[PDB]
RNA sequence: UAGCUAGUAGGUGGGGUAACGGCUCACCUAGGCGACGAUCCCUAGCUGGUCUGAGAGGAUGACCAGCCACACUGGAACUGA
RNA sequence: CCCGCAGAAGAAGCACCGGCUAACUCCGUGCCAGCAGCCGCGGUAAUACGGAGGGUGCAAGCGUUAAUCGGAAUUACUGGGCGUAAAGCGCACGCAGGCGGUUUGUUAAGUCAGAUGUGAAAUCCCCGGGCUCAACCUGGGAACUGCAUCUGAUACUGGCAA
């Protein structure tokens, strides 16, 4: 704080590391989804949350949430993980992109349709 | 060899040439010793289209600089005044 | 004239040469405090007249060894 | 120990204005009489008087306009820990011109208006607001 | 890239006539103005501070028919120009070619003027300008070409030019169907009810 | 020509014998549009009684400000409790660009185009109190020249 | 990461280069660097600039332009201005 | 680029609507299905979930994700703190370092003023010009906050002498 003390040793704010080690800080990665689960949340909430566990293309084995009502994932099903924490489940840090490699769009959906991988219904 | 030559700088399908003095083995739009005028082959039919510093050109040709065919054509165009 | 510097002899013991500390007094770029700052230089002198603790002026010349591109002009202020 | 007698002077004037003191004495020097002459000239103090022979004592008769005090905020800028030397372009105006800043220029101790008019910067001693 | 929808709906959310259907008749009479901008339009909004700033910006864009990136660029240009940024912003919106064609009475609305400008029916200084956002300089002559002169629209539009207030910074003359943008409009020469400090403060957050 | 506007309403509580009891506090600022700024706090059991006590206290306890043409004069810093507040005259620096609860007092104060930036705490009850203190100890070139002779 | 350095630091003489120079060799001296951070370790092409910022700064250095380095990997010279 | 032809004819999505944050109701579900940036919604009349109607914001785009700066005065040089919130070494002595009462003379290193050389061009900024406008291109200037040298000033700081 004294200016001599800063000449001797300057200020230094820490690095504030990343929530998502999707390495290189890439927007999506792809993985193999080693298994598929349902997992109970933390205390104020209760549900069964549909969550896969994925061997990414960079080596990391990370678990990942599966959005929307109902999926078609089973154990090999190469998916595109996204980045984004589900706070209610302890330790999922990622999401799966619905409407991507082996992850179909959400069936019978009409609103917020782009974020669930669903094409525009012809009418 | 130092060369007084044109160097293309405008947009696509719309060139603006700047006449510079470069060491001749540089790139065209690269390193130059000094720029000495310009040449717009369009500009519009208004006033100039081309101005070109004849004193510095005469200095460099006094030093030993060569002149490309366009710069020679422009000096033959702007002779002393016109 | 020539550009020269002034400094003091920091050590002596080498065979027709000397080493001189220069004190430049420069403002800190962020903090705005004028801070002393040295520059040690290996300086040549023929016949090694200046001892330790002196003050000597010094000019730049051709290389005379590794680093050593500096040679004295005038020894002042030798007082022990 | 005393290492900044100028900031000591300005401290005497802040704490004299704050205590409704009529006048302020201190040890005197050439720089304090220069600053005090600038303050009298710009209207922040009423008068000064240097007495004594072997130990001079500067005395500033302070001003109070209404019940309020005239010297609203006097600050020391170029302290010994960190000295501040401005050019004629970097030379600041205090309270958007309503308040002088005493700069020590080579021509003498002046204000910011007077030294920006004289065309020369220097060492900015104190903001008087 | 332009609005293409119900216009009087936009004029009804703002609560104020935005001159979006100037046309044949008088004051609205079939708008249900103020009453219902949607299904729950009978509700008073109790609008926020962001809501009043936003809603002022939307009032101005929906008047002059400008979208957001273009408006935002007008704010950057009005900011960098010397003077008063609200007044500079209205001076940039009033120099638009479709606006100057509307002010001269060549179009009934600003969309009709924008279609006259768009369909190569308007020259400035004897050169045809196809562009809605051409920035008309002072002492310019903007006129209608020989094609699309004596078409019905413009005649009718000049018929409803006399019902309005005849702007001071123009030479409106409808005989030859040519006009002269003489000077930049003063802030006191236009509209009196738009609060441009709200849109300065909207973009400055 | 009174130009009143409310900044903050809150629900405070008391915790008596049988459960809690919930009261509402308003915080308003009035001002004519040419100096003359006041704030009032006021607290009551319902919201319209709270705002009415706040306006009624704010119409009295109103302070003069020495404005410039339409704005401040010199940059001024006002502090109150934990809430430190800067202001800068912004000689036609268009639009009032201040924080929340400072935009309002500067709006009804009659100033139009200053630059602000509140620091520290930014509790609305103390960020005014740090704008009036601020606008109160901002003095004009005919007051400084009155003080110091000329 | 607190000690590092024996062609190492300097001198004399010989050689070498287009050119000064431990550049190289013989001999002599015992220096030199280092807490104003040497040495070691991790990372990294550098700059004009770019992005953000009221500013001071913070991040970055894709295109465009200046400089350096590399040309499968390790080394070497030949020709030649 | 200009002119002529035929006909509105070939040409509108995406996110959001509990608060922050502009924009609301009905129906289905009933701690489920699911949502979520934070606060948190959902255990039967859910403006927060899914659909519909309606609206809001942007628009040939619109959202999500990753990354940077901002907000963050939450590394504070400008511009923070330390009795009790994190923070005064258990207390001293003291080297290197930082700072140093007062007067006169000299120097002029810091400091200040001017000049010169340089700080490539482009880029940013300003005043203009050309592409129908704009983006874009471009003329002239300003700027490049720097460094070096020379000429001065000597109030403050430093050196030296008393």
């Amino acid at each position: 704080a004294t200016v001599n003390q800063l000449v001797r040793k300057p200020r230094a704010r820490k690095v504030a590391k990343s929530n998502v080690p999707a390495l290189e800080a890439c927007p999506q990665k792809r993985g193999v989804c080693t298994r598929v689960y349902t997992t109970t949340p933390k205390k104020p909430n209760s549900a069964l949350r549909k969550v896969c566990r994925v061997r990414l293309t960079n080596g990391f084995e990370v678990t990942s949430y599966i959005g929307g009502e109902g999926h078609n994932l089973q154990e090999h099903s190469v998916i595109l993980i996204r980045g984004g924490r589900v706070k209610d489940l302890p330790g999922v840090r990622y999401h799966t992109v619905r409407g991507a490699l082996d992850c179909s769009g959400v069936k019978d959906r009409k609103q917020a349709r782009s974020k669930y991988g669903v094409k525009r219904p012809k009418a | 060899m130092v060369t007084i030559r044109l160097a293309r700088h405008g947009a696509k399908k719309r060139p603006f040439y700047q006449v510079v003095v470069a060491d001749s083995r540089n790139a065209r739009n690269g390193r130059f010793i000094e720029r000495v005028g310009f040449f717009n082959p369009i500009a519009s039919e208004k006033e100039e289209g081309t101005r070109l510093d004849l004193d510095r050109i005469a200095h460099w040709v006094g030093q030993g600089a060569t002149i490309s065919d366009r710069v020679a054509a422009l000096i033959k165009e702007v002779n002393k005044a016109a | 004239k020539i550009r020269t510097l002034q400094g003091r002899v920091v050590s002596d013991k080498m065979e027709k040469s000397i080493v001189v500390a220069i004190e430049r007094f420069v403002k800190h770029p962020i903090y705005g405090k004028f801070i002393k700052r040295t520059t040690k230089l290996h300086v040549h002198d023929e016949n090694n007249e200046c001892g330790i603790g002196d003050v000597v002026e010094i000019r730049e010349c051709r290389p005379l060894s590794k680093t050593k591109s500096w040679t004295l002009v005038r020894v002042v202020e030798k007082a022990v | 120990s005393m290492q900044d007698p100028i900031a000591d002077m300005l401290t005497r004037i802040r704490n004299g204005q704050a205590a409704n003191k009529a006048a302020v004495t201190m040890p005197s020097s050439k720089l304090k009489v220069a600053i005090a002459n600038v303050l009298k000239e710009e209207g922040f103090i009423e008068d000064f008087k240097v007495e004594g022979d072997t130990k001079p004592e500067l005395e500033l008769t302070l001003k109070y306009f209404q019940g309020k005090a005239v010297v609203e905020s006097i600050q020391r800028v170029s302290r010994p820990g960190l000295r501040i030397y401005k050019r004629k372009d970097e030379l600041p105006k205090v309270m958007a011109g309503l308040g002088i800043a005493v700069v020590s220029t080579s021509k003498g101790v002046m204000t910011d208006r007077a030294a920006r008019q004289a065309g020369l910067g220097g060492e900015i001693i104190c903001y008087v607001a | 890239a332009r609005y293409l929808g119900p216009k009087l709906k936009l004029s009804r959310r703002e609560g104020t006539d935005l001159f979006l259907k100037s046309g044949v008749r008088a004051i609205d009479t079939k708008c249900k103005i103020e009453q219902a901008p949607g299904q729950h339009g009978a509700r008073k909004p109790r609008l926020s501070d962001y809501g009043v700033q936003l809603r002022e910006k939307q009032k101005v864009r929906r008047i002059y028919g400008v979208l957001e990136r273009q408006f935002r660029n007008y704010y950057k240009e009005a900011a960098r120009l010397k003077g008063n940024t609200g007044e500079n912003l209205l001076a940039l919106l009033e120099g638009r070619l479709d606006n100057v064609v509307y002010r001269m009475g060549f179009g009934a609305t600003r969309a009709e003027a924008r279609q006259l400008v768009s369909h190569k029916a308007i020259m400035v200084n004897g050169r045809v300008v196809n562009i809605a956002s051409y920035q008309v300089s002072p002492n310019d002559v903007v006129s209608i070409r020989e094609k699309a002169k004596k078409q019905s629209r413009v005649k009718a539009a000049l018929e409803l030019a006399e019902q309005r207030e005849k702007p001071t910074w123009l030479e409106v003359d409808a005989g030859k169907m040519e006009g002269t943008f003489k000077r930049k409009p003063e802030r006191s020469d236009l509209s009196a009810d738009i609060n441009e400090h709200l849109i300065v403060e909207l973009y400055s957050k | 020509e009174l130009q009143e506007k409310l900044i903050a309403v809150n629900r405070v509580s008391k915790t008596v014998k049988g459960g809690r009891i919930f009261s509402f506090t308003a915080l308003t600022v009035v001002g004519d549009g040419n100096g003359r700024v006041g704030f009032g706090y006021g607290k009551a059991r319902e919201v319209p009684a709270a705002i009415q006590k706040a306006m009624e206290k704010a119409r009295r306890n109103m302070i003069n400000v020495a404005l410039n043409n339409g704005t401040l004069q010199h940059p001024v810093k006002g502090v109150h409790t934990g809430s430190r507040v800067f202001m800068q005259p912004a000689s036609e620096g268009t639009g009032i660009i201040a924080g929340g609860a400072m935009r309002a007092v500067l709006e009804v104060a009659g100033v139009h185009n200053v630059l602000a930036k509140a620091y520290g705490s930014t509790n609305p009850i103390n960020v005014v109190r740090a704008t009036i203190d601020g606008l109160e100890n901002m003095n004009s070139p005919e007051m400084v020249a009155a003080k110091r002779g000329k």
Side-chain angles (χ1 to χ4, degrees):
Chain A
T2 296
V3 78
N4 277 101
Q5 293 179 328
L6 292 169
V7 158
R8 183 181 312 105
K9 184 161 73 66
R11 309 282 190 174
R13 191 61 179 212
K14 73 201 190 186
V15 305
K17 72 180 182 65
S18 183
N19 295 317
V20 281
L23 188 68
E24 197 185 358
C26 293
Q28 293 88 25
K29 294 301 276 171
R30 83 173 150 74
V32 198
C33 70
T34 304
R35 61 189 63 188
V36 173
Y37 284 152
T38 51
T39 297
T40 54
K42 292 175 85 217
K43 285 224 303 287
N45 282 327
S46 181
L48 275 82
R49 298 283 162 83
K50 274 80 179 159
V51 55
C52 59
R53 193 185 64 197
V54 176
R55 171 67 69 191
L56 290 188
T57 192
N58 57 12
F60 284 179
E61 176 75 28
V62 297
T63 184
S64 179
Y65 188 71
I66 298 161
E69 294 160 352
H71 61 86
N72 62 352
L73 273 81
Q74 45 202 38
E75 201 196 22
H76 288 288
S77 62
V78 179
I79 51 184
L80 193 64
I81 209 169
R82 182 160 60 79
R85 193 165 70 90
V86 176
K87 72 163 301 219
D88 194 54
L89 278 80
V92 307
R93 288 171 181 186
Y94 300 112
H95 280 81
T96 66
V97 177
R98 305 302 296 274
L101 278 66
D102 283 332
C103 186
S104 64
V106 177
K107 187 160 269 165
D108 294 330
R109 196 183 176 85
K110 303 287 186 301
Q111 300 171 42
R113 203 175 63 240
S114 152
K115 54 181 71 146
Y116 289 99
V118 189
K119 310 226 157 177
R120 180 184 172 75
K122 290 213 176 89
Chain B
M1 187 176 69
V2 293
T3 304
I4 296 106
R5 64 183 180 184
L6 266 45
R8 192 171 185 289
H9 280 104
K12 183 170 97 168
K13 296 289 201 183
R14 173 70 72 91
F16 184 92
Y17 296 141
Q18 293 180 354
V19 40
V20 304
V21 169
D23 185 6
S24 64
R25 66 187 179 283
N26 292 125
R28 177 193 66 199
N29 286 328
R31 178 181 147 96
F32 55 92
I33 304 158
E34 75 188 357
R35 66 173 286 182
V36 80
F38 59 91
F39 167 68
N40 198 349
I42 325 286
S44 74
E45 286 152 28
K46 48 174 178 70
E47 54 163 336
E48 297 197 313
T50 302
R51 71 178 276 283
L52 193 131
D53 195 357
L54 289 164
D55 301 329
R56 298 298 301 149
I57 285 176
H59 179 268
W60 285 106
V61 178
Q63 296 305 112
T66 60
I67 288 181
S68 69
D69 287 338
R70 290 296 282 269
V71 180
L74 297 178
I75 300 165
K76 294 280 291 190
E77 189 194 339
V78 73
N79 290 316
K80 314 169 198 292
Chain C
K1 64 181 178 164
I2 66 199
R3 313 160 72 256
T4 188
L5 277 62
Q6 299 200 10
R8 66 179 289 285
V9 175
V10 64
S11 81
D12 179 74
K13 184 62 191 151
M14 70 177 107
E15 293 298 323
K16 298 203 301 208
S17 178
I18 205 69
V19 49
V20 174
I22 310 295
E23 301 289 333
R24 58 188 189 93
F25 188 69
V26 285
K27 180 177 189 295
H28 186 87
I30 307 102
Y31 294 148
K33 190 204 180 89
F34 293 86
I35 298 169
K36 280 168 210 155
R37 186 67 71 202
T38 55
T39 306
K40 286 200 283 196
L41 289 175
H42 290 181
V43 191
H44 179 74
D45 49 350
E46 285 297 322
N47 67 31
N48 62 17
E49 60 273 19
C50 64
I52 200 161
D54 295 334
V55 171
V56 61
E57 292 190 353
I58 168 193
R59 68 173 183 87
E60 187 184 3
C61 64
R62 80 173 194 273
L64 297 167
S65 64
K66 200 195 264 194
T67 311
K68 204 195 287 192
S69 302
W70 288 87
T71 306
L72 63 89
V73 290
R74 193 171 65 251
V75 179
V76 303
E77 298 291 326
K78 298 193 313 283
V80 181
Chain D
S1 163
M2 280 217 227
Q3 300 177 18
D4 195 2
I6 301 305
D8 183 71
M9 173 172 76
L10 306 181
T11 300
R12 302 296 178 104
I13 299 170
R14 267 189 298 273
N15 303 329
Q17 291 289 92
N20 300 113
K21 198 66 65 59
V24 164
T25 57
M26 64 190 84
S28 176
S29 68
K30 297 305 290 181
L31 187 57
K32 292 177 186 173
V33 170
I35 295 165
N37 199 5
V38 169
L39 299 176
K40 185 177 80 176
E41 181 190 327
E42 291 296 324
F44 289 107
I45 60 175
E46 184 69 29
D47 197 1
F48 68 99
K49 174 192 291 294
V50 45
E51 293 186 346
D53 206 343
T54 188
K55 285 180 270 158
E57 296 292 327
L58 180 60
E59 180 175 14
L60 310 177
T61 303
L62 295 174
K63 280 179 68 165
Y64 297 94
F65 181 60
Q66 294 296 324
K68 293 149 72 65
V70 176
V71 188
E72 184 187 344
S73 176
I74 166 70
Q75 295 298 115
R76 170 67 166 162
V77 174
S78 182
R79 66 189 216 221
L82 183 135
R83 289 196 185 273
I84 301 295
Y85 301 108
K86 295 290 183 66
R87 292 208 290 276
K88 70 173 165 181
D89 302 322
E90 303 184 349
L91 192 131
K93 61 178 184 189
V94 175
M95 285 181 63
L98 297 184
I100 52 92
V102 177
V103 56
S104 167
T105 64
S106 179
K107 204 195 298 288
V109 170
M110 302 181 82
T111 66
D112 52 352
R113 176 176 289 187
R116 194 177 305 103
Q117 184 206 325
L120 40 84
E123 178 174 2
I124 165 148
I125 292 178
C126 68
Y127 295 161
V128 187
Chain E
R2 53 192 289 281
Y3 179 63
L4 283 34
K7 284 181 306 171
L8 226 60
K9 173 176 280 188
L10 301 178
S11 178
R12 196 168 64 192
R13 169 60 73 191
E14 302 297 326
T16 306
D17 189 9
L18 301 177
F19 297 104
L20 288 176
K21 294 177 92 72
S22 173
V24 171
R25 74 168 77 169
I27 296 174
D28 293 338
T29 317
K30 278 177 295 282
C31 182
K32 52 192 75 181
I33 188 67
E34 191 63 18
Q35 287 189 338
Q39 172 182 355
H40 295 89
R43 299 297 194 282
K44 292 186 311 194
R46 295 155 160 277
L47 197 59
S48 179
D49 183 74
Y50 180 69
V52 299
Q53 289 175 352
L54 187 129
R55 190 57 56 194
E56 186 67 27
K57 176 180 81 60
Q58 298 297 114
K59 180 173 59 184
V60 169
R61 282 172 64 248
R62 288 166 183 179
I63 286 168
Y64 295 97
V66 182
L67 295 183
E68 186 66 26
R69 208 163 314 102
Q70 189 172 7
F71 197 75
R72 168 67 167 164
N73 291 317
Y74 282 120
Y75 173 78
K76 291 181 175 65
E77 187 183 353
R80 61 158 285 283
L81 283 169
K82 291 204 185 73
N84 194 357
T85 307
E87 301 181 351
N88 289 326
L89 180 49
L90 295 178
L92 289 172
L93 289 167
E94 284 289 333
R96 284 169 62 89
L97 180 59
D98 58 352
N99 191 3
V100 178
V101 172
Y102 169 73
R103 292 288 190 188
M104 286 177 177
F106 298 155
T109 60
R110 303 166 201 265
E112 184 174 344
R114 194 184 177 98
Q115 207 184 35
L116 288 168
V117 168
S118 180
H119 287 181
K120 289 188 176 146
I122 296 298
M123 285 182 183
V124 311
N125 282 321
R127 302 175 55 182
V128 48
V129 178
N130 190 15
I131 286 161
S133 71
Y134 175 80
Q135 195 62 37
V136 184
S137 298
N139 291 116
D140 289 334
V141 179
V142 43
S143 66
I144 299 102
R145 293 179 70 187
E146 292 297 327
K147 289 179 285 302
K149 197 181 282 296
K150 74 193 269 179
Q151 293 309 111
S152 183
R153 291 202 296 181
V154 64
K155 284 182 184 177
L158 291 165
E159 182 65 30
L160 64 93
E162 297 192 359
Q163 289 171 26
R164 292 178 285 157
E165 74 174 352
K166 298 297 178 67
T168 317
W169 64 93
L170 294 188
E171 182 67 28
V172 75
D173 177 74
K176 296 185 287 184
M177 289 185 188
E178 70 177 356
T180 301
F181 193 80
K182 294 191 285 185
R183 65 188 183 78
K184 295 178 71 61
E186 186 71 27
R187 169 68 190 85
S188 67
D189 284 339
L190 68 93
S191 183
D193 64 353
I194 54 179
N195 297 118
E196 309 87 18
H197 61 86
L198 293 173
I199 70 182
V200 171
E201 290 159 13
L202 182 59
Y203 283 111
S204 190
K205 69 184 288 188
Chain F
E1 63 184 337
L2 55 89
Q3 181 62 256
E4 66 186 1
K5 73 185 290 157
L6 83 102
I7 286 90
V9 60
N10 294 319
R11 195 176 75 182
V12 292
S13 166
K14 197 185 156 327
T15 317
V16 299
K17 182 67 134 77
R20 310 174 167 92
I21 196 63
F22 294 99
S23 171
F24 288 93
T25 64
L27 176 67
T28 68
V29 178
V30 315
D32 60 354
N34 187 5
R36 292 294 303 284
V37 198
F39 76 104
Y41 192 60
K43 61 176 300 196
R45 187 169 287 280
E46 297 165 23
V47 185
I51 63 100
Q52 194 155 316
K53 289 177 185 178
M55 292 302 182
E56 191 167 354
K57 291 183 171 283
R59 292 171 188 285
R60 69 174 68 83
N61 309 114
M62 189 183 296
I63 199 172
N64 279 312
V65 177
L67 269 77
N68 208 350
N69 196 357
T71 180
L72 263 60
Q73 280 169 345
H74 60 89
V76 72
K77 310 200 306 288
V79 304
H80 195 74
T81 293
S83 183
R84 310 156 65 200
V85 161
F86 184 72
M87 284 170 226
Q88 192 168 11
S91 182
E92 218 286 313
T94 287
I96 182 76
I97 50 179
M102 185 168 176
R103 174 174 293 285
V105 51
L106 257 31
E107 182 167 13
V108 303
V111 321
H112 288 93
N113 40 15
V114 320
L115 306 161
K117 202 52 183 166
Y119 298 105
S121 181
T122 178
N123 195 21
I125 301 99
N126 290 322
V127 75
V128 50
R129 305 285 189 126
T131 293
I132 278 100
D133 299 332
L135 306 174
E136 174 174 358
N137 64 357
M138 177 183 76
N139 50 0
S140 66
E142 60 217 46
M143 294 299 184
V144 301
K147 291 195 277 304
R148 58 212 254 250
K150 57 188 190 296

